[PDB]
Design a protein around this ligand. Structure first.
Ligand SMILES: [Br-]
Ligand SMILES: [Br-]
Ligand SMILES: [Br-]
Ligand SMILES: [Br-]
Ligand SMILES: [Br-]
Ligand SMILES: [Br-]
Ligand SMILES: [Br-]
Ligand SMILES: [Br-]
Ligand SMILES: [Br-]
Ligand SMILES: [Br-]
Ligand SMILES: [Br-]
Ligand SMILES: [Br-]
Ligand SMILES: [Br-]
Ligand SMILES: [Br-]
Ligand SMILES: [Br-]
Ligand SMILES: [Br-]
Ligand SMILES: [Br-]
Ligand SMILES: [Br-]
Length: 139
C-alpha cells in the first residue's frame, strides 16, 4: 500500500491507502437508494489494539461522497466507544473523513459511496493510525 496525505510529524504515524472505484454494479449511491446501496464496495479492516484511527475518503471534486463504518465483531466487553454503524456524516464534495480516536479492537467494514447511484469514478480510502491495520476487500 501507498500512503495518503498526512502532515510530516502527524500524531498519526501510519497511513495506509486503498485505491478503489465505483463502476457498473458497484456504483450504488447512498443509503437513500436502498435498492442499490448494498452493492457499493466494501472493505474490511482489523483493529488489533484499541486506539486512534482516522479514515479519509477522496473521490472526484464533482462527486459528493461519504462512507459508513459498521462493527462486524468486537470480542472485548461492551464499552462506551462501541457502536453498530457510524458515518462520515453529510455527503461532501470530493472529500470526507471520520475520526475514531478510541475505536475498539475488532473487525469493521467500511462502505464508500457517492450520493447518487451510477456515479462512476475512482476513489482513495486512507486509514491513518498508530498501529498497523490489516485490510481486505469484500466486494
Ligand atoms: Br494508490
Ligand atoms: Br458490473
Ligand atoms: Br432505490
Ligand atoms: Br439493508
Ligand atoms: Br488523492
Ligand atoms: Br456517526
Ligand atoms: Br450511520
Ligand atoms: Br462529512
Ligand atoms: Br447528505
Ligand atoms: Br481532497
Ligand atoms: Br470535511
Ligand atoms: Br471513538
Ligand atoms: Br457490513
Ligand atoms: Br502500515
Ligand atoms: Br493490509
Ligand atoms: Br484492500
Ligand atoms: Br472484491
Ligand atoms: Br462476494
Amino acid at each position: 500500500h501507498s500512503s495518503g496525505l498526512v502532515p510530516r510529524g502527524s500524531p498519526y504515524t501510519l497511513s495506509k491507502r486503498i485505491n478503489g472505484k465505483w463502476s457498473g454494479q458497484s456504483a450504488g449511491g447512498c443509503g437513500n437508494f436502498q435498492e442499490t446501496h448494498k452493492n457499493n464496495p466494501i472493505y474490511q479492516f482489523h483493529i488489533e489494539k484499541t486506539g486512534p484511527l482516522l479514515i479519509e475518503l477522496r473521490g472526484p471534486r464533482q462527486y459528493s461522497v461519504g462512507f459508513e463504518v459498521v462493527t462486524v465483531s468486537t470480542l472485548g466487553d461492551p464499552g462506551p466507544h462501541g457502536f453498530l454503524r457510524k458515518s462520515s456524516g453529510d455527503y461532501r464534495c470530493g472529500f470526507c473523513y471520520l475520526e475514531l480516536e478510541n475505536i475498539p479492537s475488532g473487525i469493521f467494514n467500511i462502505i464508500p459511496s457517492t450520493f447518487l447511484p451510477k456515479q462512476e469514478g475512482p476513489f482513495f480510502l486512507d486509514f491513518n493510525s498508530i498501529i498497523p491495520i490489516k485490510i481486505t476487500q469484500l466486494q
